[PDB]
Amino acid sequence: EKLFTPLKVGAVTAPNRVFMAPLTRLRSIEPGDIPTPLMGEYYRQRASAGLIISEATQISAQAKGYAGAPGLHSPEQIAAWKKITAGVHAEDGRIAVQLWHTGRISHSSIQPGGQAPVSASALNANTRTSLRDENGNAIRVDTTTPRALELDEIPGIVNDFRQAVANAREAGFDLVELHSANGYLLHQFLSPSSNQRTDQYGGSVENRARLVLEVVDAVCNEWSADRIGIRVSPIGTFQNVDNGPNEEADALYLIEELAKRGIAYLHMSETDLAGGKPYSEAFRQKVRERFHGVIIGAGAYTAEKAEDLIGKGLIDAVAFGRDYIANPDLVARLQKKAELNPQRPESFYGGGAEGYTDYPSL
Ligand SMILES: Cc1cc2nc3c(=O)[nH]c(=O)nc-3n(C[C@H](O)[C@H](O)[C@H](O)COP(=O)(O)O)c2cc1C
């Protein structure tokens, strides 16, 4: 059981490999997109995780694509997050903030100015996002067709990432995780199916990776490389974003580029919740040879598959999403091979304490 053994993740040391996956729960205060003491308690309950990766958190207001998702750009968000990180720390936890821009998985109604969300190109995501109705309840809404970012707008995106990482530092997060996966902004640049640009941010894989690597460089400069992790979903299809006809070659390009930055970790979202073809161990090996930091795998993992792959030297840690939702003490439960609380998927998004902080510990 390597699952319950320590792991150096950049600037911190996880005491086990059972990580809490970033889990959008859509419980933040609006207006302001502000983390709550309730979220503080949910994270504190889960403070035994080897590492908590927070719900995806906006780098900027423009980054917002979901109602109830928190930001890390405003003083009030920073103040609220400070309490939440202090709570995790009070329990001897560690927490990374996952930082995103949702790009075209967004809706004009929650964009600054009610304007179209931005992306690499002006192509609809053809999916839904989650807004809130007038009662504050989660509802699914078709995504708004995005605007193609202008060349001159790119440095601002980079700077939003850089600023959010400076904010994360101040807020007491131990690490940050760049959300370059699952069909979101960075992923929309990466993918040829969502990126049809003909400037230096589109076409070739080098151009498609350009933004994410600029982002990585700016955030490493801002804080420190050993504070920076990144989530990718470079193989398969995620909320309609395929990785193109050269997905494997392009991933490996991207991974080798990330490697040069000496970043804390590479987190792989391997499949959508609807599933997809598993990663081949061959691919896993190719990833592992290109990247020299922590590799976290995620996507319908069982303790048994995590042990398997960590034991096989292919990944360092596993991020559990839905089991962590349902089991605050997942670490102790996996450790003791205890039964797990039943999941209540109906309360994954939005709502309050119920299905959030009422899953019991052993
Ligand atoms: C309720 C829900 C919310 C999610 N929110 C995020 C998100 O914030 N950022 C992200 O990268 N992945 C998100 N994911 C995907 C998870 O991080 C994770 O990769 C997936 O849930 C792991 O699979 P598992 O639930 O079978 O363990 C979410 C998944 C679910 C079920």
Short mmCIF file of C-alpha atoms and ligand atoms in Angstrom, two decimals:
data_model
loop_
_atom_site.label_atom_id
_atom_site.label_comp_id
_atom_site.label_asym_id
_atom_site.label_seq_id
_atom_site.Cartn_x
_atom_site.Cartn_y
_atom_site.Cartn_z
CA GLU A 1 0.00 0.00 0.00
CA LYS A 2 2.02 2.89 -1.49
CA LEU A 3 -1.31 4.85 -1.43
CA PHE A 4 -0.66 5.72 2.21
CA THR A 5 3.00 6.74 1.85
CA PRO A 6 4.38 10.30 1.66
CA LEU A 7 5.14 12.13 -1.57
CA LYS A 8 7.03 15.32 -2.22
CA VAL A 9 4.86 17.52 -4.42
CA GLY A 10 6.98 20.53 -5.29
CA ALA A 11 7.19 22.77 -2.22
CA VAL A 12 5.17 20.44 0.01
CA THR A 13 5.03 16.93 1.22
CA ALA A 14 1.86 14.92 0.98
CA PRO A 15 1.63 12.26 3.68
CA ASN A 16 -0.32 9.94 1.37
CA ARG A 17 -1.22 9.62 -2.35
CA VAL A 18 -4.95 9.89 -1.92
CA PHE A 19 -5.65 13.28 -3.37
CA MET A 20 -8.86 15.03 -3.55
CA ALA A 21 -9.65 15.73 -7.18
CA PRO A 22 -10.69 19.26 -8.15
CA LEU A 23 -14.45 19.15 -7.79
CA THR A 24 -16.65 21.88 -8.97
CA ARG A 25 -19.50 21.96 -6.37
CA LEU A 26 -20.93 25.32 -7.29
CA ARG A 27 -21.57 26.46 -3.72
CA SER A 28 -19.76 29.84 -3.70
CA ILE A 29 -21.44 33.05 -2.83
CA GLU A 30 -22.73 35.18 -5.62
CA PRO A 31 -22.20 38.11 -6.10
CA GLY A 32 -18.48 38.04 -5.72
CA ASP A 33 -17.92 34.33 -6.41
CA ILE A 34 -16.76 34.00 -2.85
CA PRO A 35 -15.66 30.86 -0.97
CA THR A 36 -17.82 30.24 2.13
CA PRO A 37 -17.24 28.97 5.68
CA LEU A 38 -19.32 26.00 4.50
CA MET A 39 -16.72 25.30 1.82
CA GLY A 40 -14.04 25.88 4.48
CA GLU A 41 -15.72 23.09 6.52
CA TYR A 42 -16.03 20.74 3.54
CA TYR A 43 -12.31 21.21 2.81
CA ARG A 44 -11.38 20.91 6.53
CA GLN A 45 -13.35 17.64 6.78
CA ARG A 46 -11.24 16.44 3.90
CA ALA A 47 -7.96 17.78 5.29
CA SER A 48 -6.52 14.23 5.66
CA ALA A 49 -6.24 13.98 1.82
CA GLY A 50 -2.61 13.80 0.81
CA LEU A 51 -3.41 16.88 -1.15
CA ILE A 52 -6.61 18.78 -1.61
CA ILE A 53 -6.97 20.23 -5.10
CA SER A 54 -9.74 22.78 -4.91
CA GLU A 55 -12.65 23.16 -7.21
CA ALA A 56 -11.73 25.00 -10.32
CA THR A 57 -11.34 28.68 -9.35
CA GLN A 58 -11.48 31.66 -11.73
CA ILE A 59 -8.26 33.55 -12.44
CA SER A 60 -10.37 36.52 -13.36
CA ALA A 61 -13.98 37.44 -13.76
CA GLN A 62 -13.70 36.77 -17.49
CA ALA A 63 -12.60 33.19 -16.60
CA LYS A 64 -16.06 32.49 -15.10
CA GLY A 65 -18.22 29.93 -16.92
CA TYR A 66 -20.26 28.47 -14.04
CA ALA A 67 -22.56 30.03 -11.50
CA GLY A 68 -21.33 29.24 -7.96
CA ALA A 69 -17.71 28.59 -8.99
CA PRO A 70 -15.25 30.61 -6.80
CA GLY A 71 -12.64 33.15 -8.02
CA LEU A 72 -9.18 34.02 -6.83
CA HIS A 73 -8.88 37.51 -8.29
CA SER A 74 -10.61 39.89 -5.80
CA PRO A 75 -9.59 40.91 -2.24
CA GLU A 76 -12.72 39.23 -0.81
CA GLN A 77 -12.00 35.96 -2.54
CA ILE A 78 -8.42 36.07 -1.25
CA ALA A 79 -9.66 36.81 2.33
CA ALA A 80 -12.26 33.98 2.19
CA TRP A 81 -9.77 31.54 0.69
CA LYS A 82 -7.26 32.49 3.43
CA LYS A 83 -9.67 31.16 6.06
CA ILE A 84 -10.28 28.01 4.09
CA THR A 85 -6.57 27.35 3.66
CA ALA A 86 -6.01 28.21 7.37
CA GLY A 87 -8.66 25.64 8.28
CA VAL A 88 -7.03 22.93 6.15
CA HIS A 89 -3.67 23.87 7.69
CA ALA A 90 -5.15 23.84 11.22
CA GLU A 91 -5.84 20.18 10.46
CA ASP A 92 -2.38 19.73 9.09
CA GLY A 93 -3.76 19.54 5.55
CA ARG A 94 -2.36 20.77 2.25
CA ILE A 95 -4.41 22.53 -0.44
CA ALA A 96 -3.74 23.43 -4.06
CA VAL A 97 -5.99 25.89 -5.85
CA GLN A 98 -7.03 24.83 -9.34
CA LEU A 99 -7.04 27.92 -11.51
CA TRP A 100 -9.02 28.10 -14.72
CA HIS A 101 -10.43 30.11 -17.44
CA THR A 102 -13.52 28.32 -18.80
CA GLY A 103 -13.18 29.89 -22.30
CA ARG A 104 -16.13 28.86 -24.42
CA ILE A 105 -17.67 26.61 -21.74
CA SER A 106 -19.43 29.56 -20.40
CA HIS A 107 -22.41 31.64 -20.95
CA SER A 108 -22.65 35.32 -21.78
CA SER A 109 -24.90 35.86 -18.75
CA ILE A 110 -22.05 35.37 -16.30
CA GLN A 111 -19.36 37.07 -18.43
CA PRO A 112 -18.20 40.67 -17.71
CA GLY A 113 -20.59 42.90 -19.71
CA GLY A 114 -22.85 39.95 -20.58
CA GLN A 115 -20.52 39.52 -23.54
CA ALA A 116 -19.65 36.33 -25.41
CA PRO A 117 -17.04 34.18 -23.56
CA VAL A 118 -13.66 34.01 -25.24
CA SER A 119 -11.87 31.16 -26.82
CA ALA A 120 -9.18 30.32 -29.43
CA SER A 121 -11.76 30.49 -32.13
CA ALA A 122 -15.34 31.47 -32.57
CA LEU A 123 -16.81 27.99 -32.26
CA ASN A 124 -19.57 26.83 -29.94
CA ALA A 125 -18.68 24.25 -27.32
CA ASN A 126 -22.00 22.55 -28.12
CA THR A 127 -22.47 21.68 -24.48
CA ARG A 128 -24.11 22.98 -21.35
CA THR A 129 -22.83 24.93 -18.45
CA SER A 130 -24.38 25.33 -15.03
CA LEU A 131 -25.94 28.58 -14.11
CA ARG A 132 -28.18 29.36 -11.18
CA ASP A 133 -31.87 30.11 -11.43
CA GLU A 134 -33.42 32.99 -9.49
CA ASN A 135 -33.73 30.73 -6.42
CA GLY A 136 -29.96 30.05 -6.43
CA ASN A 137 -30.41 26.51 -7.69
CA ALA A 138 -28.22 24.92 -10.32
CA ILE A 139 -29.60 24.70 -13.86
CA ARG A 140 -27.99 23.46 -17.11
CA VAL A 141 -27.80 25.99 -19.97
CA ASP A 142 -26.42 25.71 -23.50
CA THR A 143 -23.01 27.36 -23.85
CA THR A 144 -22.64 30.65 -25.69
CA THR A 145 -20.71 30.79 -28.95
CA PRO A 146 -17.38 32.38 -28.06
CA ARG A 147 -15.38 35.22 -29.51
CA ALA A 148 -11.93 34.42 -30.93
CA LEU A 149 -9.33 36.13 -28.74
CA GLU A 150 -7.37 38.84 -30.50
CA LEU A 151 -3.65 38.39 -30.69
CA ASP A 152 -3.21 41.45 -28.49
CA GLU A 153 -5.53 40.00 -25.80
CA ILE A 154 -3.29 37.01 -25.21
CA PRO A 155 -0.74 38.71 -22.85
CA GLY A 156 -3.63 39.75 -20.58
CA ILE A 157 -4.75 36.13 -20.26
CA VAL A 158 -1.22 35.18 -19.33
CA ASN A 159 -1.09 38.02 -16.84
CA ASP A 160 -4.42 36.90 -15.27
CA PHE A 161 -2.91 33.53 -14.66
CA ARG A 162 0.21 35.21 -13.21
CA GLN A 163 -1.84 37.46 -10.97
CA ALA A 164 -4.08 34.64 -9.73
CA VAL A 165 -1.00 32.70 -8.76
CA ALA A 166 0.36 35.74 -6.81
CA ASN A 167 -3.08 35.83 -5.14
CA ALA A 168 -2.97 32.07 -4.40
CA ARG A 169 0.37 32.63 -2.64
CA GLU A 170 -1.05 35.40 -0.49
CA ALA A 171 -4.18 33.27 0.27
CA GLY A 172 -2.01 30.55 1.84
CA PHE A 173 -2.41 27.86 -0.81
CA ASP A 174 0.41 25.43 -0.88
CA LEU A 175 0.36 24.92 -4.71
CA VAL A 176 -1.63 25.96 -7.74
CA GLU A 177 -2.99 23.76 -10.46
CA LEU A 178 -3.39 25.27 -13.94
CA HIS A 179 -6.58 23.92 -15.52
CA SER A 180 -5.37 23.03 -18.98
CA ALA A 181 -7.85 20.19 -19.34
CA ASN A 182 -11.44 19.08 -19.85
CA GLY A 183 -12.39 21.39 -22.63
CA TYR A 184 -11.59 24.68 -20.81
CA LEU A 185 -9.65 27.71 -22.14
CA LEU A 186 -6.16 26.28 -22.16
CA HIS A 187 -7.51 23.04 -23.58
CA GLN A 188 -9.42 24.97 -26.25
CA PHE A 189 -6.17 26.42 -27.49
CA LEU A 190 -4.51 23.03 -27.37
CA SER A 191 -7.03 21.16 -29.41
CA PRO A 192 -7.17 21.54 -33.23
CA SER A 193 -10.91 20.87 -33.14
CA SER A 194 -11.48 23.99 -31.03
CA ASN A 195 -8.50 25.98 -32.23
CA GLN A 196 -8.69 27.12 -35.88
CA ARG A 197 -6.39 30.15 -35.50
CA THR A 198 -3.96 31.06 -38.30
CA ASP A 199 -1.67 33.29 -36.22
CA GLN A 200 1.08 32.01 -33.95
CA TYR A 201 -1.47 30.55 -31.46
CA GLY A 202 -2.97 28.14 -33.96
CA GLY A 203 -2.16 25.58 -36.62
CA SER A 204 0.96 23.71 -35.57
CA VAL A 205 1.11 21.95 -32.11
CA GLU A 206 3.78 24.45 -31.12
CA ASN A 207 1.39 27.27 -31.77
CA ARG A 208 -1.51 25.48 -29.97
CA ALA A 209 0.66 24.91 -26.91
CA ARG A 210 2.06 28.46 -27.03
CA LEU A 211 -0.53 29.98 -24.65
CA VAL A 212 -0.37 27.28 -22.00
CA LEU A 213 3.45 27.41 -21.96
CA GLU A 214 3.46 31.23 -21.66
CA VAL A 215 1.05 30.73 -18.79
CA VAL A 216 3.33 28.17 -17.19
CA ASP A 217 6.37 30.44 -17.66
CA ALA A 218 4.65 33.49 -16.21
CA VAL A 219 3.39 31.62 -13.15
CA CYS A 220 6.75 29.97 -12.47
CA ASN A 221 8.35 33.37 -12.72
CA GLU A 222 5.73 34.86 -10.44
CA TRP A 223 5.99 32.40 -7.60
CA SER A 224 8.18 29.39 -8.13
CA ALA A 225 8.07 26.37 -10.40
CA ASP A 226 7.82 24.04 -7.41
CA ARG A 227 4.44 25.66 -6.56
CA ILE A 228 2.92 25.00 -9.97
CA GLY A 229 1.03 21.97 -11.17
CA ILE A 230 -1.03 21.61 -14.29
CA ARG A 231 -4.04 19.52 -15.27
CA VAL A 232 -4.23 18.19 -18.87
CA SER A 233 -6.77 15.86 -20.64
CA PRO A 234 -4.72 15.40 -23.82
CA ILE A 235 -5.99 11.99 -24.90
CA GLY A 236 -9.66 11.34 -25.69
CA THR A 237 -12.66 13.63 -25.85
CA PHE A 238 -13.85 15.85 -23.02
CA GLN A 239 -17.04 17.84 -23.26
CA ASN A 240 -16.80 17.77 -27.09
CA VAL A 241 -13.13 18.78 -27.19
CA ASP A 242 -11.22 16.02 -28.91
CA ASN A 243 -7.45 16.18 -28.96
CA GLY A 244 -7.12 16.06 -32.74
CA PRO A 245 -5.84 13.31 -35.08
CA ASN A 246 -2.32 13.45 -33.58
CA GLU A 247 -3.44 13.47 -29.94
CA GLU A 248 -0.60 11.28 -28.68
CA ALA A 249 2.24 13.15 -30.45
CA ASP A 250 0.81 16.50 -29.47
CA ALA A 251 0.47 15.47 -25.77
CA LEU A 252 4.05 14.34 -25.68
CA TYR A 253 5.19 17.62 -27.22
CA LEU A 254 3.25 19.47 -24.56
CA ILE A 255 4.54 17.28 -21.77
CA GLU A 256 8.20 17.69 -22.84
CA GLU A 257 7.69 21.43 -22.93
CA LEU A 258 6.19 21.40 -19.42
CA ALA A 259 9.08 19.28 -18.22
CA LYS A 260 11.58 22.11 -19.06
CA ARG A 261 9.89 24.34 -16.55
CA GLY A 262 10.56 21.98 -13.59
CA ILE A 263 6.95 22.34 -12.37
CA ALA A 264 5.64 20.51 -9.31
CA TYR A 265 3.25 18.21 -11.10
CA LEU A 266 1.28 16.97 -14.03
CA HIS A 267 -2.26 15.99 -13.31
CA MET A 268 -3.99 13.85 -15.99
CA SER A 269 -7.73 13.82 -16.35
CA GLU A 270 -7.78 10.52 -18.27
CA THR A 271 -11.42 10.28 -19.25
CA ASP A 272 -14.68 12.18 -19.13
CA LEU A 273 -17.27 10.89 -16.60
CA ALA A 274 -18.99 9.22 -19.64
CA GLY A 275 -15.78 7.24 -20.13
CA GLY A 276 -13.43 6.77 -23.05
CA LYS A 277 -10.57 4.48 -24.02
CA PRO A 278 -8.24 3.97 -21.10
CA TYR A 279 -4.65 5.20 -21.28
CA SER A 280 -2.35 2.47 -22.50
CA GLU A 281 0.58 1.75 -20.22
CA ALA A 282 2.71 2.54 -23.30
CA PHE A 283 1.39 6.12 -23.31
CA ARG A 284 1.77 6.26 -19.57
CA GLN A 285 5.42 5.33 -20.06
CA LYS A 286 5.96 7.93 -22.71
CA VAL A 287 4.48 10.54 -20.38
CA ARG A 288 6.59 9.40 -17.48
CA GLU A 289 9.81 9.66 -19.57
CA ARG A 290 9.04 13.23 -20.56
CA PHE A 291 7.99 14.57 -17.19
CA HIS A 292 10.10 14.63 -13.99
CA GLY A 293 7.65 15.82 -11.40
CA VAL A 294 4.61 14.31 -9.73
CA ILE A 295 2.08 12.70 -11.99
CA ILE A 296 -1.46 12.41 -10.64
CA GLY A 297 -3.95 10.25 -12.47
CA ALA A 298 -7.69 10.67 -12.28
CA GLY A 299 -10.87 9.26 -13.79
CA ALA A 300 -12.98 6.50 -12.25
CA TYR A 301 -10.01 5.18 -10.26
CA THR A 302 -10.56 2.57 -7.62
CA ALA A 303 -8.08 2.26 -4.77
CA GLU A 304 -7.06 -0.94 -6.48
CA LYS A 305 -6.30 0.70 -9.85
CA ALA A 306 -4.40 3.55 -8.05
CA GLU A 307 -2.28 1.03 -6.12
CA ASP A 308 -1.78 -0.80 -9.38
CA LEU A 309 -0.53 2.19 -11.37
CA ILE A 310 1.44 3.81 -8.49
CA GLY A 311 2.96 0.41 -7.76
CA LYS A 312 3.83 0.18 -11.45
CA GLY A 313 5.80 3.49 -11.23
CA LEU A 314 3.59 5.17 -13.84
CA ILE A 315 1.84 7.76 -11.65
CA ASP A 316 2.62 9.12 -8.18
CA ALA A 317 -0.83 9.77 -6.83
CA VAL A 318 -4.48 9.42 -7.60
CA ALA A 319 -7.08 12.13 -7.48
CA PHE A 320 -10.49 10.73 -6.48
CA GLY A 321 -13.39 12.89 -7.33
CA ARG A 322 -16.72 11.32 -6.44
CA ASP A 323 -15.44 9.12 -3.64
CA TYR A 324 -14.05 12.25 -1.94
CA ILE A 325 -17.35 13.96 -2.40
CA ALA A 326 -19.00 11.08 -0.48
CA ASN A 327 -16.17 10.29 2.00
CA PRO A 328 -14.46 13.10 3.92
CA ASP A 329 -12.26 10.51 5.59
CA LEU A 330 -11.69 8.62 2.33
CA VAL A 331 -8.04 8.18 3.35
CA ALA A 332 -8.97 6.34 6.59
CA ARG A 333 -11.67 4.41 4.79
CA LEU A 334 -9.41 3.26 2.00
CA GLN A 335 -6.76 2.59 4.58
CA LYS A 336 -9.07 0.43 6.75
CA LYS A 337 -10.91 -0.97 3.72
CA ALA A 338 -14.08 0.38 5.20
CA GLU A 339 -17.30 0.57 3.20
CA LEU A 340 -17.83 3.96 1.60
CA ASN A 341 -20.77 6.25 2.01
CA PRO A 342 -23.19 5.95 -0.92
CA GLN A 343 -22.85 8.80 -3.34
CA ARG A 344 -25.77 11.15 -3.79
CA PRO A 345 -25.02 12.59 -7.28
CA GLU A 346 -28.09 14.79 -7.19
CA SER A 347 -26.34 17.05 -4.71
CA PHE A 348 -22.96 17.22 -6.48
CA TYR A 349 -23.64 20.70 -7.89
CA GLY A 350 -25.08 23.59 -5.97
CA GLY A 351 -27.33 23.38 -2.90
CA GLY A 352 -25.89 23.66 0.60
CA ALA A 353 -24.63 21.41 3.40
CA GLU A 354 -26.69 18.40 2.30
CA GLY A 355 -24.63 16.13 0.09
CA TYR A 356 -21.64 18.39 0.89
CA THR A 357 -20.65 18.34 4.54
CA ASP A 358 -23.14 15.68 5.82
CA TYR A 359 -21.27 12.68 4.50
CA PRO A 360 -20.10 11.10 7.75
CA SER A 361 -16.61 10.09 8.79
CA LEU A 362 -16.16 6.59 10.15
C1 LIG B 1 -19.12 16.88 -9.47
C2 LIG B 1 -17.93 16.93 -10.38
C3 LIG B 1 -17.20 18.13 -10.42
C4 LIG B 1 -15.98 18.22 -11.08
N1 LIG B 1 -15.30 19.43 -11.11
C5 LIG B 1 -14.03 19.51 -11.67
C6 LIG B 1 -13.26 20.69 -11.71
O1 LIG B 1 -13.36 21.54 -10.84
N2 LIG B 1 -12.01 20.68 -12.31
C7 LIG B 1 -11.49 19.52 -12.90
O2 LIG B 1 -10.38 19.49 -13.46
N3 LIG B 1 -12.25 18.36 -12.85
C8 LIG B 1 -13.50 18.33 -12.24
N4 LIG B 1 -14.18 17.13 -12.20
C9 LIG B 1 -13.52 15.88 -12.67
C10 LIG B 1 -12.79 15.37 -11.41
O3 LIG B 1 -11.71 16.22 -11.01
C11 LIG B 1 -12.18 14.00 -11.58
O4 LIG B 1 -11.19 13.99 -12.59
C12 LIG B 1 -13.20 12.90 -11.75
O5 LIG B 1 -14.37 13.16 -10.99
C13 LIG B 1 -12.40 11.73 -11.20
O6 LIG B 1 -13.21 10.64 -11.43
P1 LIG B 1 -13.94 9.97 -10.19
O7 LIG B 1 -15.09 10.82 -9.72
O8 LIG B 1 -14.45 8.69 -10.77
O9 LIG B 1 -12.91 9.69 -9.14
C14 LIG B 1 -15.43 17.07 -11.61
C15 LIG B 1 -16.11 15.83 -11.55
C16 LIG B 1 -17.36 15.77 -10.92
C17 LIG B 1 -17.96 14.41 -10.65
#
